[PDB]
């Protein structure tokens, strides 16, 4: 992320460099040479320390805090949405096979894992339930 660097660059260049050079641009626009030579005096000396690197760093830190809190809330309000089963809620063989080749097989492990599968689009749910019931009957038939 490094959004602190982003806001620091934004304030320093897009805002602070822009308006600090806009002081000189207003100078060039007003000229009447002494007009601009004064224009760079009183507003700028009222501007002193409001554009310091210290003040830029302070306000950018405040903006970073605001944005960090806001994105923290945005992450918090999406932690909960899951249109799927979560990980760590399914046996070792399943969490291996679903994402990669298990590198080994064990039928006994498979049956005591598939026996743990819970009850629950609607078509996916239906095929899940039918397939799971068929699998349970298959391992029962084995044992018999």
């Amino acid at each position: 992320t490094d959004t602190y660097n982003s806001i620091s660059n934004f304030i320093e260049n897009e805002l602070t460099a822009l308006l600090s050079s806009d002081d000189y641009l207003m100078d060039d626009l007003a000229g009447p040479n002494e007009v601009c030579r004064l224009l760079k005096a009183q507003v700028i000396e009222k501007r002193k320390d409001a554009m310091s690197r210290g003040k830029q760093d302070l306000l950018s830190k405040e903006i970073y805090d605001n944005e960090s809190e806001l994105r923290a809330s945005q992450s918090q309000q999406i932690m909960e949405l899951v249109g799927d089963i979560p990980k760590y809620s399914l046996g070792s063989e399943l969490r291996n096979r679903v994402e990669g080749e298990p590198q080994s097989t064990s039928i006994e492990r498979l049956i005591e894992d598939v026996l743990k599968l819970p009850q629950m689009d609607l078509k996916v749910l239906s095929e899940y339930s039918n397939l799971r019931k068929d699998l349970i009957l298959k391992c029962q038939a084995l044992q018999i």
Binding site: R37, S52, R53, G54, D57
Partner: protein
């Protein structure tokens, strides 16, 4: 022990000696555009030297103090890292 003697002396030099040197020459040359030019560019050079060194010395001071300040806040961030 002599930092704001140095910067003050430089800043003092520019408004006390440089700025009037070009300004009076710039004012005098109303009859000669080419010489009034050399003095107008000298006056702009001395005005930009004035403002530039003023906020550049402000910048050396501000960068020093803010570097120490940011170092301290970095200590704070590291403390948070350790706690977690």
């Amino acid at each position: 022990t002599t930092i704001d003697v140095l910067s003050s002396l430089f800043i003092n030099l520019f408004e006390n000696d440089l700025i009037p040197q070009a300004l009076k020459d710039f004012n005098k040359s109303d009859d000669d555009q080419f010489r009034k030019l050399l003095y107008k560019l000298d006056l702009r050079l001395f005005q930009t030297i004035s403002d530039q060194m003023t906020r550049d010395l402000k910048d050396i001071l501000d960068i020093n103090v803010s570097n120490n300040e940011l170092c301290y806040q970095l200590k704070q961030v590291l403390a948070r890292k350790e706690d977690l």
